[PDB]
Write an enzyme that holds these catalytic residues in place. Structure first.
Site, PDB file in Angstrom:
ATOM      1  CG  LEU A  43       3.597   4.655  -5.982  1.00  0.00           C
ATOM      2  CD1 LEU A  43       5.266   4.323  -6.453  1.00  0.00           C
ATOM      3  CD2 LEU A  43       3.141   6.119  -6.436  1.00  0.00           C
ATOM      4  CE  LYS A  47      -2.945 -10.829 -15.190  1.00  0.00           C
ATOM      5  NZ  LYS A  47      -4.291  -9.918 -15.993  1.00  0.00           N
ATOM      6  CE1 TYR A  48       1.561 -14.561 -10.349  1.00  0.00           C
ATOM      7  CE2 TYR A  48       1.807 -13.005 -12.401  1.00  0.00           C
ATOM      8  CZ  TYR A  48       1.475 -14.301 -11.838  1.00  0.00           C
ATOM      9  OH  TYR A  48       1.134 -15.399 -12.827  1.00  0.00           O
ATOM     10  CB  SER A  49       3.400  -7.304  -6.506  1.00  0.00           C
ATOM     11  OG  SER A  49       3.636  -6.462  -7.578  1.00  0.00           O
ATOM     12  CD  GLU A  50      -1.875  -3.336  -3.015  1.00  0.00           C
ATOM     13  OE1 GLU A  50      -2.051  -3.804  -1.899  1.00  0.00           O
ATOM     14  OE2 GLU A  50      -3.039  -2.924  -3.389  1.00  0.00           O
ATOM     15  CB  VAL A  51       4.061  -0.800  -6.639  1.00  0.00           C
ATOM     16  CG1 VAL A  51       4.816   0.361  -6.671  1.00  0.00           C
ATOM     17  CG2 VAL A  51       5.015  -1.956  -7.221  1.00  0.00           C
ATOM     18  CE  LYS A  66       7.330  -6.504  -7.854  1.00  0.00           C
ATOM     19  NZ  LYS A  66       8.042  -6.745  -9.062  1.00  0.00           N
ATOM     20  CG  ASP A 154       5.898  -8.472 -18.118  1.00  0.00           C
ATOM     21  OD1 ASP A 154       5.203  -8.439 -19.070  1.00  0.00           O
ATOM     22  OD2 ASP A 154       5.622  -8.107 -17.135  1.00  0.00           O
TER      23      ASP A 154
HETATM   24  O1  LIG Z   1      10.817  -3.496  -9.552  1.00  0.00           O
HETATM   25  C1  LIG Z   1       9.416  -3.217  -9.695  1.00  0.00           C
HETATM   26  O2  LIG Z   1       8.361  -3.944  -9.705  1.00  0.00           O
HETATM   27  C2  LIG Z   1       9.074  -1.776  -9.166  1.00  0.00           C
HETATM   28  C3  LIG Z   1      10.130  -0.561  -9.180  1.00  0.00           C
HETATM   29  C4  LIG Z   1       9.208   0.873  -9.358  1.00  0.00           C
HETATM   30  C5  LIG Z   1      10.011   2.012  -9.073  1.00  0.00           C
HETATM   31  C6  LIG Z   1       9.432   3.063  -9.075  1.00  0.00           C
HETATM   32  C7  LIG Z   1       8.053   3.280  -9.587  1.00  0.00           C
HETATM   33  O3  LIG Z   1       7.308   4.608  -9.604  1.00  0.00           O
HETATM   34  C8  LIG Z   1       7.377   2.106  -9.753  1.00  0.00           C
HETATM   35  C9  LIG Z   1       7.804   0.871  -9.585  1.00  0.00           C
END
Ligand SMILES: O=C(O)/C=C/c1ccc(O)cc1
Length: 325
Positions: A43, A47-51, A66, A154
């Site tokens: 998705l 900067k600190y992760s990949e989703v 994540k 944030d």
């Molecule tokens: O907690 C997070 O950093 C990410 C949650 C998340 C849930 C649905 C998404 O479409 C993208 C990120």
């Protein structure tokens, strides 16, 4: 040096609770089955992760995975603890599971799935009623985490997941979230540039939950005025100059004097002298239907230099702006 500052609400929530609740370093992570989740598509990276959009193949339900990039041991523990403490709270993203990624070897956080519609296309479409409604939904999340001794740090459109069809909203990415401790000095290198409070921009370290309220005000001003972002700085120094051309320089100097803060001498050749602008200056034929006296009075009480003089999330929910909703 600088005058100390305390939050005017939820000051002592963490000091009364047991050590286990706020001391995330000593937290023991109860791992789940990595095999339960199957990655479908990336998705986004951060900067600190990949989703990743994923599927929990046990219940066939959409989830979000994540995978945390190797940054620091402490930051990871902090995010898990904050999510576990806020799980079930109004409009807080639900942490479904914590698994160890076989590839990255780092922990991968599993969240409930929210059908978010892109803020770029969503901010161009919101009606006056919708801004109010969604703002109230965010306020529920902000008052809940602040009541629990947590500041998000944030707050921005990308950290607000909106299922516009089901009128659902989730406050996500608690990777920058911290436990509020009265008198504690924090890193000013938090939040995204356009949403950075003046306390961050002037290097004032004894900040609190009120930082989230300034960030919320930035989002509000962008929505009601149809100006994205509202304060468009070229860098962290031009960011303060952008705020000053609206809020004025006198209140900025009054604020730094109150906290006995020394402003970076770099500001002397760029800050200038500015009078406070009346909010109806940013009103025009393409945003006027989104603007009301209640919207401007509410915005005016969020966008204050003095972090102590800003509305708290609970007072913000009490505002005449939310009567319609
Ligand atoms: O907690 C997070 O950093 C990410 C949650 C998340 C849930 C649905 C998404 O479409 C993208 C990120």
């Amino acid at each position: 040096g600088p005058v100390p500052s305390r939050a005017r609400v939820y000051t002592d929530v963490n000091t009364h609770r047991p050590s286990e609740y706020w001391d995330y370093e000593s937290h023991v992570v109860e791992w789940g089955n990595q095999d339960d989740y199957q990655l479908v598509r990336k998705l986004g990276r951060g900067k600190y992760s990949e989703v990743f959009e994923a599927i929990n193949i046990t219940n066939n339900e959409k989830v979000v995975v994540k995978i945390l990039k190797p940054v620091a041991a402490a930051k990871i523990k902090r995010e898990i603890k904050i999510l576990e403490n806020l799980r079930g709270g109004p409009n807080i993203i639900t942490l479904a599971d914590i698994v160890k990624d076989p590839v990255s070897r780092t922990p991968a956080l599993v969240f409930e799935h929210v059908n978010n519609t892109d803020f770029k296309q969503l901010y161009q479409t919101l009606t006056d009623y919708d801004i109010r409604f969604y703002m109230y939904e965010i306020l529920k999340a902000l008052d809940y985490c602040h009541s629990m001794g947590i500041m998000h740090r944030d707050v921005k459109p990308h950290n607000v997941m909106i299922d516009h069809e089901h009128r659902k909203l989730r406050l996500i990415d608690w990777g920058l979230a911290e436990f509020y401790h009265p008198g504690q000095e924090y890193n000013v290198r938090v939040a995204s540039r356009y949403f950075k409070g003046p306390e961050l921009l002037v290097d004032y370290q004894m900040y609190d939950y009120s930082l989230d309220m300034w960030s919320l005000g930035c989002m509000l001003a962008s929505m009601i005025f149809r100006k994205e972002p509202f304060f468009h700085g070229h860098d962290n120094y031009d960011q303060l100059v952008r705020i000053a051309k609206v809020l004025g320089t006198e209140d900025l100097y009054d604020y730094i004097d109150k906290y006995n803060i020394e402003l970076d001498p770099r500001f002397n050749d760029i800050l200038g002298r500015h009078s406070r602008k009346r909010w109806e200056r940013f009103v025009h034929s393409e945003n006027q239907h989104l603007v009301s006296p209640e919207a401007l009075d509410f915005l005016d009480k969020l966008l204050r230099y003095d972090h102590q003089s800003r509305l708290t999330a609970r007072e913000a929910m009490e505002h005449p702006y939310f009567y319609t909703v």
